[PDB]
Design a protein around this ligand. Sequence first.
Ligand code: CL
Lengths: 53, 53, 53
Amino acid sequence: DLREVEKSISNLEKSLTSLSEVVLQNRRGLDLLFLKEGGLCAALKEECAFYAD
Amino acid sequence: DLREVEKSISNLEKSLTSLSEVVLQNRRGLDLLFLKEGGLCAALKEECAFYAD
Amino acid sequence: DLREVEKSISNLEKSLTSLSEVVLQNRRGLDLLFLKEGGLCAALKEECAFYAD
Ligand SMILES: [Cl-]
């Protein structure tokens, strides 16, 4: 029962790891589409958001 | 031990918050790339997906 | 108390589901922006990342 809660958290951690690989690959695609404009953040006029695990 | 499970859930919540900042900044980049076409959802011919915390 | 930890994990699972809908719609937008170049992965020269729930 406490083991079942721990297994759900491990599954959920593997899911977030998978999803973050999709997100960061999307970010690299946007960095390439915005190469001539100074990059994604410079074009939005925003501070860049980075992912911390 | 129950405290260790609670700490893992708090770490995991801080991670998802960080990742969602990257995702929403990517969405704003796509909204700008698709400005002339009526926006990302109008160009996909989809209902827009929004993030609910 | 164990029920409160389980409720937090269910809320967190609903959040990740919501966020993944935003991420995959962003991926479909990038697939369309990169249609002429062979697709997002072919343009990055990367193996494609996919999301596994
Ligand atoms: Cl994304």
